[PDB]
């Protein structure tokens, strides 16, 4: 059955990118999905997402701009310390500053660059490039 909606959101985005779509709909919404999309917009990988209220659990409408090669969820959500980000960069990304690891911290959801600036670690939940 349904186990993880974030993984599904990101796989749907990847496949629609591969075949050249413009708008994509994500049916079970969540605040993690909201925050991940917020990070992606700030870094310029999408455009103009909005939230829609069905009576069940909202929908997210997202617009694409042809900038994503691969996006995915990281399972299991590994814990990571402030001094141990390069291992995972090498494991998930193709070059040294190319893409973003999305990290969940006690201070909120952010990229590993922001997290390193603040000197904090947390949990890995997504990669985008």
């Amino acid at each position: 059955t349904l186990l993880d909606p974030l993984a599904n959101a990101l796989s749907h985005i990847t496949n629609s990118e591969r075949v050249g779509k413009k708008e994509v709909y994500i049916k079970p919404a969540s605040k993690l999905i909201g925050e991940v999309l917020r990070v992606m917009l700030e870094n310029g990988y999408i455009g103009e997402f909005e939230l829609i209220d069905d009576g069940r659990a909202g929908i997210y409408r997202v617009q694409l701009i042809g900038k994503i090669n691969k996006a995915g969820a990281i399972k299991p959500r590994f814990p990571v310390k402030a001094r141990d980000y390069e291992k995972w960069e090498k494991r998930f990304l193709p070059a040294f500053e190319f893409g973003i690891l999305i990290v969940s911290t006690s201070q909120g959801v952010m990229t590993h660059k922001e997290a390193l600036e603040k000197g904090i670690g947390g949990r890995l939940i997504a990669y985008v490039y």
Partner: protein, 149 residues
């Protein structure tokens, strides 16, 4: 119905996303509750009570109009069932099927149906124990279900 047969049917209801009740409704909350109680005393189940309210009285979503559910109304009053309706329905089915198989020993295709019914019963029993609508040690026994029904 996917639990055993694994067919992906979709034949349900389309409820619109409403925050508030509509104005074309003729009845008020107190009249609605009184109707619920009357139809219970006539000997109806919750689901039929609601179907009748929707078909003959024009009431959508007792929970929209009132702020409560049918079973909550009946518990506010003294007309709720001691064990839940779905479980009772399943137990009745099992009891009837068992008396059938006492006279038909070599059917052999309805016995699997019995087994499936009783597995469903056990699932629900395990849930209702956790939630508290049954004691933590309640057990399904056919010989005593014969009297439950």
């Amino acid at each position: 119905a996917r639990i055993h047969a694994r067919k992906r049917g979709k034949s349900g209801s389309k409820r619109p996303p409403r925050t508030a009740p509509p104005a074309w409704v003729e009845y008020t909350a107190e009249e609605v509750e009184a109707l619920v109680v009357k139809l219970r005393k006539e000997g109806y189940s919750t689901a039929m009570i609601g179907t009748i309210l929707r078909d003959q009285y024009g009431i959508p979503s007792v929970k929209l109009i009132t702020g409560k559910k049918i079973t909550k109304i009946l518990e506010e009053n003294g007309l709720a069932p001691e064990i839940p309706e779905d479980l009772m329905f399943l137990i009745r089915r099992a009891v009837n099927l068992r008396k059938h198989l006492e006279q038909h020993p070599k059917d052999k295709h309805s016995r699997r149906g019995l087994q499936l019914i009783e597995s469903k019963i056990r699932r629900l029993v395990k849930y209702y124990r956790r939630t508290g609508k049954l004691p933590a040690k309640w057990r399904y026994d056919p010989e005593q279900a014969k009297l439950l029904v």
